[PDB]
Amino acid sequence: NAADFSLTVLRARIALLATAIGGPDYTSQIDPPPYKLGDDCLACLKDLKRWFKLVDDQQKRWDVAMAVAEYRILTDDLLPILIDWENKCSLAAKLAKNNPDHEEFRNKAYYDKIALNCLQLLVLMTWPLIVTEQSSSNQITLYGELKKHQLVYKKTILSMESGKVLRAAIRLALDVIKIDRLSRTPRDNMVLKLVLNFFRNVIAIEPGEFTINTKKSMPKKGITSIDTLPPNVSMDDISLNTVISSFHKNKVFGFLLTLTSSLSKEFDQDFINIPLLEIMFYFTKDVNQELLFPRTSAGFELSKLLQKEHQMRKNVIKHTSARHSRFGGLLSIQTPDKTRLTVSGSQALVDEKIALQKLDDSKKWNKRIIKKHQSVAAEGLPNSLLNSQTGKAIFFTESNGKHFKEFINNFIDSGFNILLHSVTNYFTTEQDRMVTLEQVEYLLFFAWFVKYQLLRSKIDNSADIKQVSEALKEVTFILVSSLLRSAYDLKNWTVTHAGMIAFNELLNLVSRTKAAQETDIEFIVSRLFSDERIQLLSNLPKIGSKYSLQFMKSCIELTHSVLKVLEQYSDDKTLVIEGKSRRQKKFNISEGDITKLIEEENVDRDEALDILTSSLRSIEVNFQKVQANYMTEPVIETYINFLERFRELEDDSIKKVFSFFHRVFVQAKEQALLFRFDLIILLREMLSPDGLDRMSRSRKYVSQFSDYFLARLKKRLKKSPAWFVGLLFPPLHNSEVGFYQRYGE
Template identity: 30%
Template sequence: MAQQTTLDEWARDPLVDPEVRAHVYSLVNALGGNGEDGTYTLGDDALLCLKDLRKWLKFADAELGRRDAARCMAEAKLLQGDLLPILAKMSEKLMTQKLKYKVALAVLELLVPLTWPYEIDPLEPTENQINHAPYIQLAQIGYKRAILHFDRAQILNTVVKIALPPMAIPLRERGPRDEAIIRIALYFIRNVVMLSPPSSVPVDIDEAEVSRSTTIDTLHDQEIFPALLTVASNIGEDYVVQDVVILEVLFYLLKGIDAEKLFLDEKKLSSRNTDELKALMQKEKAMLADSARHAPTRHNRFGTMVWVKRDDEKVSTLSGQDFLGKAQKTMEKMDKTKKWNKPKGRSRKKNDEFDRDEFDLEVPLTTSAHKHLKSFVEEFLDSSFNPLFMHLRKAIEREEERIEERHSRQYFYLVAWFLKAECARRRNLKEKAADPKSAEILTAEDESYGLVAEVLNQATFILLNRFMQKSQDEKAWQDLNAGMKCFTQILFTVQEMSESALEEDQEIAENIQNRIFYEEATHDRIVQMLRSYKDQGFGYLDACTELAHVFLRMLERYAKQNVDLQIRSKRRARKMEAKRQGADSAGADVSDREEVENAQRTSTERKFDFDRYAHKFVNQSSVNTFMAFLKLHNELDAEQLKRIHRFLYRAVFKMKLGILLFRVDYIQLLHKLIKGPEGLDAALPSFKEWDEFVRHFFRTVVKKVQERPILYVEMLFSKINSTMFYLENGFDMAPPVRTPRAPAELEVKGDMTRQEQIGVAVGVLVNQNKSDALRWVREVLSSAIEERKAWQSMEEARREVAAAERQVEESGEEAPAEEPPKPPSILVRPDNDERRTAMFKDNKLRLLMTLVGCSRLGEPNDPEATWLIGSSVTVPELTEALDLIRKFEFEPPIYEDGKSAQDFLRSKATAIRRTARRVDFDDDSDGVDNDTEEDRGEYAPDGPTARKSTAKKILKRRRRARTPEELDDEEKRRRAEARLKRELEKQRNIKSTVFVHSSDDEDWDEDRDKEFFAKEQALRADTLAQFKRSLALGSPEPASKKRKGNVQAGSEKKKRKTPPKRRKGLFDTDESEDEDQPLHSSSRGSSPEAAALDTESDGESTDTPMSSQPAAVVTNGNKTPASVADKDTVMADAQDGTDDDDEDAAPTVRRAPLRTRGGFVIDSDSE
């Protein structure tokens, strides 16, 4: 129902297009109006009018950005005068009549864009968007008031009824239209909860009518909370895309509400409200008392003006009488009257979205709203928290299209809010259970933290750390604020879990703390967030200081409980890779090798040092953050003041870093805090602690200033790391002395001769333009040759003189010849300091010196170690080395494939590690190996076998079966030595040799050879007798594969008592294990059963059992016991002796118990 105006008035309005206004007003008039009986009556084309109005909102406003249609609908009172009466008229018969359902749905589709929070395009704002903003924002507050207080019907309840039919359809059968209906119904509830009075526009209605308390009461009265719980508890099963809408509803419903107050009982809540009121009244009283000291009276009403003459001959004028009598008062008055037009920097522009998402402003609740919200939160925690937040976390991780930038911030804020609420609820339950007058009893479910388990897992921690790091990098301070609140509340929850009565919760808390404190990146992030405060606002300041305080105290406690705490640190390592470019097809020259630096993240574990981290934590930037927080002491509560006090006490007295507070403004702030004016209230519980801290701090300041007067100047500035140590101790910090480290020792690759190795070393030095080093080596060798020759000449002369003086004894026997003395070692002296340094650091020069005969005495990392030319190096060797250096210096060697001398060098340590690398055993292994250095002569074991040996696995398996208990190291070593000794003894008994020798080269032992030939003669005789016996019995059949399988299968069964077997002959094979039986018999033919089976297999098979006990078969004069009939038997099918087609058939092996009749064994074929 539109308000009638003239066309002239429409034309004169410069803000709205007259054509748009005419169309909108005509549609509103055609929609309907009040009839004669006072009830609302729909027009004939009401449904079409609703659809046309929605089109105007969609195309004229959303696409063109004009917002003219929304302005016209607000002026025409469309929502209050038409849409709400239509919903009220349709609500009664909504579920029965299809036409009324369509009309109600069309009204809902129009209500959602009308109540959608007004936003100005941040990238391309239009003039109409800016001009219409105040009017439309005020109109939306009127919309909210009309919806909440509509008396003829429950609007929100009617909207839920519209969404009920689609909600009743299963998820798999639900279509896109059904999903859209559910979504717009939830969005309408979100819009109603989200709308709030704009801060930039004065509101002409009572704000209590659209307050949070009124909204909560309306949601409860119209039964919206059960609908929200239904959707939230079934997220992931019946609802998928509705999770972000529920998230926004919860965020705008709960932001700014104190979760701890929510779960206080009435008495404690009333007491807390009373204490807060008393504190406010006390602050007001202190302010009045302070102003009363300077309030005008009857005697000082007359004007007073004073001129103050300053040092620079300038005059300042002061008026009033409040500064008379005291110079300090005069200066304070001058400071108050000073004006400084501070240049305005680039400040962040706070838009309406920022105001809507602001969650640091506390929102008060009425008693009824407090009660209703508490009931809703309890039910939500019990039924909906885990499924909803698990589904949201996965959606954020996958970066679903429906997830916007603000949703991550809202998610982490709500995680913090609900964790705080759950902890408050548990404390309330414990207090009630501890009260003897209360009937409350704690159950296991109440003790467990399973209701919030989905936000205390590793996936949530990873997502939170990633979100905080991203927010910090992008300087999204509001997002980082939400992340810090979430992390702080997780720490509080874990702390309470560690104090739980359930061991499972304690173990979970221990695991969570270990994961949180294990990452050094988390430690560094906390410090960086504290340092990065500048002017992000009170909420950010409170969040970062609280997180730092809680994290540091919990980390200190955990480090004391876990002395060997290990943390993982990630550092950037530089890996040098050499790449070679191949020659092209045209035969181009090979390019030089290039060194490429690849930066990679390496993770290392190290022991955590809390003192070291605390020094990193306490620095000038973090002190500045806490002092900025202290400047707001009049607005802080007792817990926040205690937080600042603990940090400053740690910095000044525990860590002896009070020099960080030696700044004029900080000293003045601490003095003002106690002595005033506008200091702390002396009635506060923490005033005594602050008073004591300030007194001890000023004593420290006076003492330090007397020791070092330079602090008078340094108090004007912040302290830097380079001067802090001097200001604290009075002397500069001694630079750390690093122990020099010798370079890696080099060697020449391949099997090169000494001359070739010297050529490589000389070539490397020549390529590096170190001709001066080669000259020095030549001089050293030349000097050594001359000195060694001089010594040899002197020694030869001495021997001649000694021989001439020596006399032969009278007996005629000559005296024993003396051993010639060794030449003395020659000391290698560097010619300058640079050469001395090169002898320690240049590994190429050291390689050449080693190759020419020099040796180094001393520790590997001793720069003053001595180089000598040993006594064993002869003059020819030195001369040869000198000649090779002279040769290769001017004619460097040339190598194949374009290689340089550098390519033939390698690190000696790397080569040793490669050759000495062995396979590590597992925990069950005791390190037994056969890589001993003992010489086993010709009977050493042969080379590698064709297949991999399984002896080690069998040995482990037997060892584990034999010793299931844990063995100490001494026992393992003893057993390993015993096994090794047995292995060596067994290998010494091997009677075959690996090598073939020429008979002329061997030393014959007659006794040993006699014994050997005797054994060989007996072996040949045995073989010949066996051959003759086989000829007498008939031609032996060739052992088939089937018989081989039977033999092998039979050998794996249980051991039987068999006649003694003779040693195998020269032509024996593994398949024939009993050579005293005919070749066609089984390997177990020594038993009566096997003999009977083999006899049957040669002829026709029969099902008739044997009627008499068979005689025992005698083999080699030994009788087989009859008890073998109880043992396993190889079952062979009867077959014709001439049939060769079944040779490849697999043998049939059974371990089934045998059936007997009258003491006889029955073949399986007869069953």
């Protein structure tokens, strides 16, 4: 009985400390009770810090955090102290601005110290909870309940008189900022890092995940809920709309803007370069850029959604029986091989297809579908576009959406370039030491802001694309490409997905800058497609089909971007690329040749030797070879697997898939890749009234491709009946007959 005795004495001591911090001053008679500090209360703040140090850190326990959380130290002690300090300092600043050296604080240093210690406890207690492997069983047991207590913390921070603690935190930051750059000690810049970390804790708190034990078999009741919410906390309090509202009301956005825009001239950038990027990522991990531009209007889209629902409901009730359930109708169908098969239904009486769909659906044997089990959640990472569903939408309001649009616009127009340059300065030396979290957030920050500036420049001509021009430096090229390559070779798949998104948006930015101006563009397209990266982008779709839907959609968008940026050089032929030479490329140099090159391009001979070596590995690639390398059967397998989810996707992704199917089936002219039966079943499902809408623009090119596909199919089967077997099975590899199977000789 040592464990529960230690737990109850620890809870008793935290209860005594929480009573010893302060009181609401019920002795004074004010209609709101003003919070009064207790006697010897700064020592209590140091005791909470000492308890969180000695127990929570080295001993690998989280009992102190819940012992604090159940006694409401953050809710009832730290926040009233910080808000009282904020209100008193604001009133004193007003009275000192009107008349200086009148009505001072009695003990301002004490109040500043206890405010700083309260902010330290806010950062230390709202830290993001990650539970990796080999951790203690106490943390594994306590993780979900501590995530719920952190959700209560985020709601209480954002909701207490619209978040005056954010104003307290920025006041603690401008205590540092008012000091000159030369007179600032590193402790003051560490206080600035504390404030930026507090804002990243406020943004970064998200609802937890529901973990189940799979040792026992799942019963017949199954999962009834996956809700992981505290009682008073709803999904609206946690959501980003309240974050944007509380940040705009308390001028957090102007604080972040004025530290981002003067990061190099005013602040020591190495202290706050990483928490600033973490803050930007924690805004932009769950925001889609297409939904931020909306292009009675809510009722307009509502009326269109009810028309779509009415058409789908009509197509559903076509299959629904007109009579009741007990009105028994039995139908015996025969094949031309004489047999009797019985189905039970009323709608299935008249049409053959509903009856055959009944006969397919009456079976109770289901094949195994193996699952990856979503191992991304095992790593310590937030929910983002790599984890959310493709159909997930963030529902910004008018004012919150306008404030977020203004903040992101001023961020890009002020200091996206300086922040990106500072981060790619820092990470290019810390590349081999960063864990997956910084790689994922760097690639997502880069890709999100590049995509948002691309979309803003496409929508409006007032914005300049050169505001993300520092995305196009060689250092960011090297960093993104090396991150993607190191993610692939170590078989890390989250960073591979983030780098795939970043490379797709990098190619989109290069294509936009090339279409704008027709130069350094040939240099950078030679730089990205150098080394073995064409083979990397070629074999990324071959391994796509095993992983999740978002990985496969990124494979779609990356391969579409690769083929679009490489089809621009089909006639221009400018495809000189640094390649990796394998066997001996040694050449006996000639110093006369070296000196005449020195006269030619005005070079020193050491870097001319470098140029002479680098000219030997230069090769040229064929775009037809790039297409024919992309036409492997697992690429078609993963694209057919992506087209299976055609209900969830929008028009753009299936437009990309059918554009690549036009590339396979019309241009490249080998057609046996698409002569498989899963595509035929999927095309029947898409062209049915239950599938794609007739008013949607997707069904037009789906129908056109299916018409041309069945025309070539009937041509191939009329010329050769043996392909009646070939639709069932994967294509054949024997060289004596495989040419006739693939091309028809």
